[PDB]
Amino acid sequence: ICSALPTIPYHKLADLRYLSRGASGTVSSARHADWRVQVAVKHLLDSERKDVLREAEILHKARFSYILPILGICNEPEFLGIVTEYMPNGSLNELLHRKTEYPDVAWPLRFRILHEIALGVNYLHNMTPPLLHHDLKTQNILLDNEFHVKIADFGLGTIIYMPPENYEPGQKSRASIKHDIYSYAVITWEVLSRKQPFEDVTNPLQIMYSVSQGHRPVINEESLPYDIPHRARMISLIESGWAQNPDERPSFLKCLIELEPVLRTFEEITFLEAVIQLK
Amino acid sequence: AICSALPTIPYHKLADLRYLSRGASGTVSSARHADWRVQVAVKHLHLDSERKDVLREAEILHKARFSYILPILGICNEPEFLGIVTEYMPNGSLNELLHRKTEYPDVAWPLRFRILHEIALGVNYLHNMTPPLLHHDLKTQNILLDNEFHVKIADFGLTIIYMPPENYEASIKHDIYSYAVITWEVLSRKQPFEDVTNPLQIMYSVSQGHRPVINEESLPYDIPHRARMISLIESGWAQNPDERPSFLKCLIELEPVLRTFEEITFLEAVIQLK
Numbered sequence A: 001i002c003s004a005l006p007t008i009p010y011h012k013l014a015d016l017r018y019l020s021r022g023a024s025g026t027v028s029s030a031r032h033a034d035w036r037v038q039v040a041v042k043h044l045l046d047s048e049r050k051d052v053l054r055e056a057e058i059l060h061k062a063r064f065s066y067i068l069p070i071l072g073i074c075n076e077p078e079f080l081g082i083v084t085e086y087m088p089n090g091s092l093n094e095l096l097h098r099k100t101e102y103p104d105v106a107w108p109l110r111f112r113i114l115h116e117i118a119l120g121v122n123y124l125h126n127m128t129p130p131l132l133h134h135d136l137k138t139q140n141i142l143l144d145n146e147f148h149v150k151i152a153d154f155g156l157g158t159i160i161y162m163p164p165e166n167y168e169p170g171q172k173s174r175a176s177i178k179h180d181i182y183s184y185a186v187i188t189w190e191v192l193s194r195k196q197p198f199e200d201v202t203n204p205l206q207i208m209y210s211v212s213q214g215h216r217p218v219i220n221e222e223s224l225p226y227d228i229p230h231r232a233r234m235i236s237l238i239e240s241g242w243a244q245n246p247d248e249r250p251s252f253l254k255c256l257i258e259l260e261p262v263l264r265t266f267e268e269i270t271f272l273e274a275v276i277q278l279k
Numbered sequence B: 001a002i003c004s005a006l007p008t009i010p011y012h013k014l015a016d017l018r019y020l021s022r023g024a025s026g027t028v029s030s031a032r033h034a035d036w037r038v039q040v041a042v043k044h045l046h047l048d049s050e051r052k053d054v055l056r057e058a059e060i061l062h063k064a065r066f067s068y069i070l071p072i073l074g075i076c077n078e079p080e081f082l083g084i085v086t087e088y089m090p091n092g093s094l095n096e097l098l099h100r101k102t103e104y105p106d107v108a109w110p111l112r113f114r115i116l117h118e119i120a121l122g123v124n125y126l127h128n129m130t131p132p133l134l135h136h137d138l139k140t141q142n143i144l145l146d147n148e149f150h151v152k153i154a155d156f157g158l159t160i161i162y163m164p165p166e167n168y169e170a171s172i173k174h175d176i177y178s179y180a181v182i183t184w185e186v187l188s189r190k191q192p193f194e195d196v197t198n199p200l201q202i203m204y205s206v207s208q209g210h211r212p213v214i215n216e217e218s219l220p221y222d223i224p225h226r227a228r229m230i231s232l233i234e235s236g237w238a239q240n241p242d243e244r245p246s247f248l249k250c251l252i253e254l255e256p257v258l259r260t261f262e263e264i265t266f267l268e269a270v271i272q273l274k
């Protein structure tokens, strides 16, 4: 059973407005003149033409509840762009570090975010053939209208989410199914702390040296208080994921099985209250 | 062509397969994917014609992918079991939200209008497909509600109160008729044709140009946007199919209404249901 991705005439997008730069390109918001929905458009050589068409192919094949939904492709002599559902609430990074805009980010939502990132990345790994993210960062973990996760920019510059064996990449590191879990371990640490990993450190070059030595962000009372739900299980999960040996790192499936009970300790209502709190 | 193949799910990967209800084609059960770690819904009949009917529904769902259409996760196609796997909708259907008044004494206006906006967005996407895909069985019972009380339409392109009189015998003007009745029902929270004992009495009444009662009792004068909504309902359910609006027009009418509601009003209409 095959589903073709719709082709969207550029002239069908109205109210086109700049939002930001994406992974590679500009991200604009617009509205579909016929579908009557708000959309996001990622737009930018006939070499770079197959580049945009590759992301579109990946998003289309990687379709799932925690992966950014692609609506169609603009493929015209005058314009090339990917059209997706519009994500109103930015990225994880901005929820985590825009502390004036967001003074509180409730534990139910934080853990829900973590659970959804794992459910997302895991789906990529369970595809046939396995799809690898390799650039999982807080900046590309997008938040929908009700602050649910949509992962983007996978399978296509902050080194803090990079495993040390990828610093000088080989064929083995670029095919490594244990890169994403290191990134996830740094994100988990960052989410539970609301702190910038290696904040104290001056050079990103310096970070690379200590990270390659063995140093990870600090796991202590100051960064991760004792009042953190399931702290022991969490700290175990982080340290297990950012393990210097790729072979000593858990799969996303193993983490999920560990996270499933954690999330069940939060009353359904608390997730909804956490969201209302951000508004 | 950018093609995507619908995943094949092995029946052994669908754990805790516990019954939910029935559905148009067959039985609806809830389950969990072993590897993906998510709650899912499975649709299976409880024979070659039935097999071709099931795969056609799954082809429709996979081709009709949009924000307000039930998202299909994969096909479970084995000799032991044949089922359609989709996301799990934990909040029932629009029918239950409207008529389970004990469970839901208050269903706030922002949410009712959002629900109507999203049914129209879903049906409008179908009509905009190439070729246009007509629903022809739009009813409150197959308008599903997800985790955030957003609409997901199901049982499209495959009870008599949502059927236009001319259909009692494939026009693009059928769905708007159904939509007009659903709108009446969402705004009133009343069963269309309350007094009627036999579905034939409804069918007779409708064919004679009669419709669910628009009065102060069915539609209180304090309903937001009452004049506009009545006008959309009355045009939608016109005896003349040609006097009925397109879903585009129907959406152009609804857009100024939805702009009057801030996102928080939707969040607090949902928390009130909890």
Ligand SMILES: C[S@@](=O)c1ccc(-c2nc(-c3ccc(F)cc3)c(-c3ccncc3)[nH]2)cc1
Pocket (backbone or CB within 6 Å): B020, B021, B022, B023, B024, B028, B040, B041, B042, B043, B061, B070, B084, B085, B086, B087, B088, B089, B090, B141, B142, B144, B154, B155
């Ligand atoms: C009341 S009757 O008219 C009726 C019709 C359809 C359904 C009904 N059909 C489905 C359903 C499931 C999978 C499919 F592929 C197609 C439809 C669901 C469903 C989907 C996701 N999560 C929970 C339930 N509910 C239930 C009752």
Ligand SMILES: C[S@](=O)c1ccc(-c2nc(-c3ccc(F)cc3)c(-c3ccncc3)[nH]2)cc1
Pocket (backbone or CB within 6 Å): A019, A020, A021, A022, A023, A027, A040, A041, A042, A055, A059, A068, A082, A083, A084, A085, A086, A087, A088, A139, A140, A142, A152, A153
């Ligand atoms: C600057 S950081 O690297 C960064 C990376 C990606 C994005 C970013 N990329 C996208 C985006 C859009 C379309 C695609 F096809 C792929 C990604 C979005 C997006 C999607 C839907 N609604 C709003 C925004 N945001 C924003 C910031």
